[PDB]
Amino acid sequence: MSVPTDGAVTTSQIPASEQETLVRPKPLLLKLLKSVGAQKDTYTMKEVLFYLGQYIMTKRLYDEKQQHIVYCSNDLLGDLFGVPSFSVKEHRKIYTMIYRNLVVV
Ligand SMILES: CC(C)(C)S(=O)(=O)C[C@H](C1CC1)N1C(=O)[C@@](C)(Cc2ncc(CC(=O)O)s2)C[C@H](c2cccc(Cl)c2)[C@H]1c1ccc(Cl)c(F)c1
Numbered sequence: 001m002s003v004p005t006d007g008a009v010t011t012s013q014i015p016a017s018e019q020e021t022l023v024r025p026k027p028l029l030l031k032l033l034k035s036v037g038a039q040k041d042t043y044t045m046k047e048v049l050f051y052l053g054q055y056i057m058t059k060r061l062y063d064e065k066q067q068h069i070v071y072c073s074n075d076l077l078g079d080l081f082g083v084p085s086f087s088v089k090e091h092r093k094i095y096t097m098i099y100r101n102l103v104v105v
Contacts, residue, residue: 008046009053013091019046022105028080029101042105048098052077062088 002010010019024042025033029052033043036054043051056062061077062070070077073084081097088094 004046007050008044009050010046011049011091014095018095019044019049021045023048023102024105025102028076029098032076032080045095045098048102049094052098 002012004010010016022042022044025048029048030038030041032055033048033051036051036058038047038051056070056077059075059077061072061075068088069085070088071085072078072081078084080101082100083097086093086097
């Protein structure tokens with residue numbers, strides 16, 4: 001991954017321009033972002049990914065770093081994505097799950 005700013009994370013798995021897409025999170029996604037310090041209603045996708053990563057780590061949903069699975073069936077995140085678990089390595093899949101929870105500007 002790459003970190004172009006102190007509040008953004010990017011990946012070579014997704015086109016660079018796509019990660020600059022402006023989005024307005026729906027209520028659940030927005031709540032998760034603000035719980036780790038986000039202070040706005042519109043974000044670029046790379047910012048959303050940063051804050052959601054912060055949420056995941058703060059909630060201890062990725063304690064086992066060598067296995068690349070996030071376990072979230074009992075967390076708000078599981079309800080948001082509609083899955084009990086997912087791989088942190090499958091970036092298109094993650095983007096897809098996030099897109100379902102926002103409006104693209
Ligand atoms: C290190 C930090 C800057 C704090 S991080 O990158 O934000 C940590 C984070 C951990 C919480 C899951 N994470 C990951 O750990 C990454 C490194 C997971 C991997 N992707 C690919 C890997 C090896 C490979 O190329 O096969 S390892 C990179 C992974 C990532 C980065 C950028 C975009 C996407 Cl879609 C995913 C990132 C992450 C971000 C957000 C969500 Cl919702 C995730 F499920 C995963």
